[PDB]
Design a protein around this ligand. Sequence first.
Ligand code: CL
Ligand code: CL
Ligand code: CL
Ligand code: CL
Ligand code: CL
Ligand code: CL
Ligand code: CL
Ligand code: CL
Length: 310
Amino acid sequence: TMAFQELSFQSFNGKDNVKAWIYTPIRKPRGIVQVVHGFGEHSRRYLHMILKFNEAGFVVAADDHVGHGKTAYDSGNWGDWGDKGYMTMAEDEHTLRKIVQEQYPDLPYFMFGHSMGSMIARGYAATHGAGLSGLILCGTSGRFPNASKLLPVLKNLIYEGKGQETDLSYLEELMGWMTERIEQPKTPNDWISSDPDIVADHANDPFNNFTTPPNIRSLYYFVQMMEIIVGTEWAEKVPVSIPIYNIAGDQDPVGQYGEGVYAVSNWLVQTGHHVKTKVYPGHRHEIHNDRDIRDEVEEGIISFINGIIV
Ligand SMILES: [Cl-]
Ligand SMILES: [Cl-]
Ligand SMILES: [Cl-]
Ligand SMILES: [Cl-]
Ligand SMILES: [Cl-]
Ligand SMILES: [Cl-]
Ligand SMILES: [Cl-]
Ligand SMILES: [Cl-]
């Protein structure tokens, strides 16, 4: 029975070695939470939350996805998620799940995802959702602006053989609008948080990446992940046995400023799911890092999980 673990497994893409960690509670384990990070960040930003989960009695598993964090640093690959399709990241989450459940086979299992991590987790719940006791979505998207238009454009560029080329202009089309509500934004990433210190730390963390853009096929995957989880057509694929906790800030462009977050909740409720939502007024994207609400955000996640375990 191992406690803290630092591990690696081969990616579904067949080339990257995914770096991952397992963090165990000192108390008798009561559950497992798998933490799925978002675009351009990495899993060790989540240490504060992970430790809180451990103190609640939860085992925590998290990896740095392909193209991200220590996985990207050790491989030198920041821009290419590979040639195996948009399911790659969900499949790598599945590999990590099987590792941690082999160690802890009888515990209730929960998946937490923030931003692209919530997109991965939503797709995961529709493809590998059996056995999930609960799903936590943070900073999630409704219909994400420009995603549906770029999807055929990028698909064509792949068919024309340009999938491994990099064109920053498509990423700017997809994400350049996100500071639209902010007066005099000091950086294009000010939508991350209204605390400039959080934005600056994100910029200065060498395991984050907003410097090397994804290549065309990886951007295609990203927009595929955005679009495959839209609507009741997606929500019906998620077993109603999985309760959902859906949280965001209402100044977050990723979730259309609260409206897209509640649209996701509605798609799920309309298809028979048990959903609990909390939108934090006046906060941008990273509600779980904003220091004035971080403890409340974490306690809410833990309360949701505890309500399911017993
Ligand atoms: Cl392996
Ligand atoms: Cl003690
Ligand atoms: Cl603290
Ligand atoms: Cl167990
Ligand atoms: Cl979308
Ligand atoms: Cl390609
Ligand atoms: Cl800032
Ligand atoms: Cl709709």
